[PDB]
Structures are given as C-alpha cells and as structure tokens.
C-alpha cells in the first residue's frame, strides 16, 4: 500500500504518492463561488469551483483561501479541498491509503485536532501522521544537521536541527511570506 503525501500549504496544495520524484498534483488552495446573476439556464452551473477550474473561471468568482498563515480557518472549504484532491486530482480512495499531512510549527492544537477528526471520520483512513515541513526539507536536502528556513505563502519559519535532534526552544516562526508580498506589490 502506497502512502500519501499532501502538503496543504497556504498558497498551493501539493499532493502525491510515496516513492515518486515530482508531486503528482500541484494546484492552488482556492474555493470559488459565483458572485453574479446567473442568467443562462442549465449548462452545468456549479455552486462552487475548486482548484484550477476556479483559476480559469476567476473573472466571475469570489475566490476564498481556506488557509491563512498556516491555520485552517474555514473548514467546509478545507473539506472540499481535500475531497477534490483525493477524488479528482489523484483519483484515489482514502479508505485504503495512509496519509501524511504537513504543518507549520507553533500551530494551534485545535487545527491538529480537527484535522485528525475530519481526516479520520469524513475521509476515514487506516492511519495518519502530522509532520513538520522543515524536517522534510532537511530530508530532501539529504543531510544531517543545519538550520532550515522554510518560507511558503503564509509561514516563514527557521528550524535548527543538529545530528537528528531538533531544538524546539530555537524554532522561530514569522507570518511574513508570499501573500504579504503580493499585497505589498498591490
């Protein structure tokens, strides 16, 4: 049974299988809703759009980001993100696949609680694990020690690890990343 990796980042959801080099699905974490008078009848009008479909039709959609600064605020949009990334992007059954999920350090614990509860009840799995992104970045570097500066779209955090031992008193999180740079460029 192949395990699943699903980095639910603030900007871009990146999901795929173990033992693979490139991520199978990389798509932005947006849920769109229509904001205009639907005048045409039929033709497959949806109540919501997830992912690249919301990116294509973005002229007539209010786009919502369910993750801000690493914290999942809206949860049914997050469930729609997970249902899309399980059943459309990857086209797999979550009932037969363990799932590793990523998380920023110094997160609220209730995010982990509700992530565990939804991921064990709505999309019920054999098993699950929540990791830290910088440790996986040090894994991809292939080395032992060092300080990892991981900077996504919401979270920029430094994690120092020496000889496979993290130092939790020296984790430095800052909520300044690419979305703030996008707002500043605006």
């Amino acid at each position: 049974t192949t395990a699943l990796v699903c980095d639910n980042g603030s900007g871009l959801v990146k999901a795929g299988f173990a033992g693979d080099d490139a991520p199978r699905a990389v798509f932005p974490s947006i849920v769109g809703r229509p904001r205009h008078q639907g005048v045409m009848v039929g033709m497959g009008q949806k109540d919501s759009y997830v992912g690249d479909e919301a990116q294509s039709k973005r002229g007539i959609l209010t786009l919502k980001y369910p993750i801000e600064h690493g914290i999942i605020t809206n949860w049914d949009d997050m469930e729609k993100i997970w249902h899309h990334t399980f059943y459309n992007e990857l086209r797999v059954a979550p009932e037969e696949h363990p799932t590793l999920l990523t998380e920023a350090p110094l997160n609220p614990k209730a995010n982990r609680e509700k992530m565990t509860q939804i991921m064990f009840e709505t999309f019920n799995v054999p098993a699950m694990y929540v990791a830290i992104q910088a440790v996986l970045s040090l894994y991809a570097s292939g080395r032992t020690t060092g300080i990892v500066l991981d900077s996504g779209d919401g979270v920029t955090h430094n994690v120092p690890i020496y000889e496979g031992y993290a130092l939790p008193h020296a984790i430095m999180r800052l909520d300044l990343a690419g979305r703030d740079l996008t707002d500043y460029l605006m």
Partner: peptide, 21 residues
Amino acid sequence: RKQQLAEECVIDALLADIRKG
C-alpha cells in the same frame, strides 16, 4: 605454583530514500 607454571546514519538512510524517490 610450580605445577601451575608447568601448566601454562542520517546520510545513508536519506540517500536510500532519495534513490527510492
């Protein structure tokens, strides 16, 4: 005493996972 004297690895694991992909 005369009778006694007459008697006398992060690196290997991570590179393994890299080559597994």
